[PDB]
Curated annotation (Swiss-Prot):
Subcellular location: Secreted
Transmembrane segments: none
Family: Belongs to the bacteriocin class IIA/YGNGV family.
Disulphide connectivity of cysteines: 9-14
Keyword terms: Antibiotic, Antimicrobial, Bacteriocin, Disulfide bond, Secreted
Purpose of the protein: Bacteriocin.
Name of the featured protein: Enterocin-HF
One GO CC term, this protein: extracellular region
Biological-process GO terms, alphabetical: defense response to bacterium; killing of cells of another organism
The gene coding this protein: entHF
Organism: Enterococcus faecium (Streptococcus faecium)
């Protein structure tokens, strides 16, 4: 599985680096708080 935040897993095992992804979410939500931008998301 590949989420897209630095994750790796095929057969041997997984090693999702749960450290950098957290920094990407903080900004993602920050855009919803400021409400200063448009977006055609699914919703």
């Amino acid at each position: 599985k590949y989420y897209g935040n630095g994750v790796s897993c095929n057969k041997k095992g997984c090693s999702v680096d749960w450290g950098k992804a957290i920094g990407i979410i903080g900004n993602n939500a920050a855009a919803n708080l400021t409400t200063g931008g448009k977006a055609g998301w699914k919703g």
